[PDB]
Design a protein around this ligand. Structure first.
Ligand SMILES: Cc1ccc(CN(C(=O)N[C@@H](CSCc2ccccc2)C(=O)O)C(=O)c2ccc3c(c2)CCN(Cc2ccccc2-c2ccc(Cl)cc2)C3)cc1
Ligand SMILES: Cc1ccc(CN(C(=O)N[C@@H](CSCc2ccccc2)C(=O)O)C(=O)c2ccc3c(c2)CCN(Cc2ccccc2-c2ccc(Cl)cc2)C3)cc1
Lengths: 142, 140
């Protein structure tokens, strides 16, 4: 328990320090780091679209899924691409922050579950057809 | 998939941390330690380079170098600042191993760090309120 959590902290810290030098702890660590960076990049470049989105958000536990679904359906209306997948993660992140800001922290675990289901059902088939997350890492790094 | 749930959790942990929030207690510790490591490495830019002048890392001498540095680091006792330096040292030794084309040493360094943490740091950590105390102190 303390043993597993100590190994987890070590792995997390070393994954981070290796990534800062262009190295990686594992394939999964390389995906996680490249997605974190892509999220930061997307949010900064589309800071206006991010600001317009958060301003229009009126989060309540009863309308949270509705808001999630409407944005995600609009986002992927014309199909899937890596850029839109990054925007999907950025949107989930913004909805979680907005939930915590509005003292609705209970929504965070729900949003993560909705994201994971949407990924499994609607994004994973396209991801697998397009070479998987390794292709994303390769394309983003280039 | 398990890996898709893991990516979601990782991304959300990061975005919540950027606003001073956290996904979980464990995510808050990981993020506070990553930041403290970055801060220590910026404040002491030449600390590892001053050590490398004598640490010629090889699979045969890596453990002896790790053990000596870590024993010298904690000679006067444990504190949070030295624990951060311990993680930064491990990180630097892993980078140096990959630079010297001996990435096979990375998983051994990780195992040595985890054993030192379990055996020699965890009693002081637990006596000092656990990793929550570190998060509280670093955030202040
Ligand atoms: C890191 C990064 C990611 C994405 C881009 C932009 N981008 C492209 O550069 N695309 C490429 C094709 S992918 C190439 C690629 C990219 C990354 C890695 C690997 C390969 C192209 O065009 O050549 C897009 O695709 C792209 C994707 C989504 C959106 C835009 C553009 C424009 C703004 N729009 C707002 C929006 C509309 C509807 C519904 C919701 C939201 C919305 C989502 C979240 C919030 Cl928080 C707020 C609002 C979302 C730029 C940088
Ligand atoms: C985020 C942060 C952490 C630590 C500090 C610095 N620092 C202090 O400021 N400490 C405090 C008391 S703890 C306060 C605290 C800190 C963080 C969180 C919470 C509370 C003080 O004194 O006021 C120290 O403790 C401290 C600890 C270790 C060392 C130093 C200073 C100076 C350099 N020295 C080199 C060295 C010597 C022997 C063996 C190995 C190495 C060596 C380790 C790793 C490599 Cl990579 C290379 C070489 C190691 C500064 C910022």
């Amino acid at each position: 328990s303390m043993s597993q959590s100590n190994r987890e902290l070590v792995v997390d810290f070393l994954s981070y320090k290796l990534s800062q030098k262009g190295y990686s702890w594992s394939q999964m660590a390389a995906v996680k780091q490249a997605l974190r960076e892509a999220g930061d990049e997307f949010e900064l470049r589309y800071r206006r679209a991010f600001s317009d989105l958060t301003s229009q958000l009126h989060i309540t536990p009863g309308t949270a899924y509705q808001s999630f679904e409407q944005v995600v359906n609009e986002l992927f209306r014309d199909g899937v691409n890596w850029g839109r997948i990054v925007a999907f993660f950025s949107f989930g992140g913004a909805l979680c922050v907005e939930s915590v800001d509005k003292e609705m922290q209970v929504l965070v675990s729900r949003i993560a579950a909705w994201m994971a289901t949407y990924l499994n059902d609607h994004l994973e088939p396209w991801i697998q057809e397009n070479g998987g997350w390794d292709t994303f890492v390769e394309l983003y790094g280039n």
